[model samples]
Target: MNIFEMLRIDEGLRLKIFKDTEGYYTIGIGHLLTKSPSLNAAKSELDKAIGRNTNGVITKDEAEKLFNQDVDAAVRGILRNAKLKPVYDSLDAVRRAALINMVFQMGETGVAGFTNSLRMLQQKRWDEAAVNLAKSRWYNQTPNRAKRVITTFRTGTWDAYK
Candidate 1:
């Protein structure tokens, strides 16, 4: 089966908000309420359906589409608000993807809190940027993922941790 199909099965197609194994408020193929502006926005749109209870109903295709759009918006917001458009445009595909993923995990405001790391990136101090990233709470929260991102900054390659 395709990746999307496999993911759908793994995540399960749920129309309503239910706590996953981790106990986070989620709906529509594992869309978490926390750290997901798109999911939150989609919920808001559905919330308007008074007495219809449409908020708890969504197709798999619709869920995927909403996720893709949300991801795109998040990336755009990062590019615009981080003031890293010039630098972002100059990076290779892997580095650019890494930056986008970082912004996805941490919202624009959350990413903006990394002053030293952002400054290092702006100055083209890739090593320093990686170091700064390692020093942040993000690193502590997800060390393996953070290390992969850090490696991308330090090496300019998609050397993700396997």
Candidate 2:
């Protein structure tokens, strides 16, 4: 675990600008500058961030800086969530990472949408929690990752990756 590779591997590190699955102009650990924009807009937006052209490559140094910022935001996203706050303290570290990753990937609103799943997990209803996750479009979005995350809920271990 990179303490970060968890997030990194999924989002990826790209110095060169490219479109994501949704065709958004994205770069550097999945930072989406503009959801929809002309190439000029995307380039200008990216140039504004790094202050260097994206023509050759972007520095891992700057990417590291940005990635950490995003990760920190993702962590706070979970903690700042009122609905999650109730169960946050009780969630085990392994499961805590899972929740953080959930927020990191989908935003708090996405996780918030899983009302009962959160309820079941908070109550330690592992199977039910896992089942609820399996039933979502999150599963539809990334079945492989979703299955792994679901198993983490079921087993309460990062060993799901193992």
Candidate 3:
């Protein structure tokens, strides 16, 4: 009768992980699993979406609701794990957004692993953090993006990559 009912009819709910017709791992109403930075990240998202110990399926509408909730929770978790609340709060919007973006790309824990950069940030050592950020594997993997973040860290400006 409703859109949710219609979706249920079209995409039957399943209680456990199963391979979809196309071989993608799926569960619940139709949550597709794919590779992330780590399988743990994917699993973490799935578990948060559906409940870590859920033993039964949910309605299509419920699954959709959970998707939005899980994404918000994931973002909050990333910020929480960043563990530089004081410094993060003091940053201008542009730098704050850049840091959040970095956390999104590298999990919060991964970003936190930038020990030297974080230490410099705590000490108001912009140059040190910039240099430290530029000397990492992340910089090596994506030089352009790393340059943008480094520039933001150094100058507190948003137009470095623009």
Candidate 4:
């Protein structure tokens, strides 16, 4: 079977992956696993593997496959990169993690589509950004999911474990 077959993409899971970083294939989201980079070096290995496999051409089908193989690896790639540290740190873990999932679902451009909202976030305009996040066109596409994320981002509280 192909990698896509292994990942098992349906409308439900397709919405789960998103881009988490700034560069190619950096976007990620949802409840997917994080990369298991014991020494952090494995991130590069995974990146190379993903690069060879994906070649930056992503489709909803391909995303399903990628997430299945190593969602954590993709996330670790973003977390390990220095430039993304501020972006990663600026968010509370809940929102940050959710956005990472969004990035995984959408590509970097998908996340970049929220340019104004991100600017608001960078400026510490919390309420405005939070609202903007919910009001975004992308959010409109996934109202329930976006609202949940916006609520968590604004309130800084989300513990699914509870």
Among these predicted structures, which one has the highest lDDT?
2
lDDT of 3 by residue, 70-162 (tens): 344435754576465655676766666556556644556777677768778767688878888888888897677678667777887755644
RMSD of 1: 5.8
Of the two candidates 3 and 4, the one with more favorable lDDT, higher being better, is 3
Give one digit per residue, the lDDT tens place, for model 4 in 1-162: 221221122113423223332122232222232344232333343345456543333456455455554545445655665544456678765656655555555544556557677777666677888888876666776666566556555665653212
* Candidate 1 per-residue lDDT over residues 18-59, each given as its tens digit: 655445556665555543345565455555422233555666
Candidate No. with top TM-score: 2
2 or 3, which is superior by lDDT? 2
Q: lDDT score, residue 147, model 1?
A: 82
- Those runs of model 2 whose alpha carbons end farther than 4 Å from true positions after fitting are 51-56
Per-residue error at 105 for model 3, in Å? 0.3
* Positional deviation of residue 28's Cα in model 4 after best superposition, in angstroms: 15
Candidate 3 accuracy as TM-score: 0.54
lDDT of 2 at 47: 83
Q: Kindly state the number of residue pairs that clash in model 1.
A: 0
Q: 2 or 4, which is superior by TM-score?
A: 2
Quantify all predictions' global Cα lDDT against the true fold.
0.64, 0.77, 0.61, 0.50
Whichever of 1 and 3 has more TM-score, that candidate is: 1
Candidate 2: tens digits of C-alpha lDDT, residues 66-141 = 7787778877877888887666677887788778778877777888788988999999999988888788888987
> TM per model?
0.66, 0.86, 0.54, 0.50
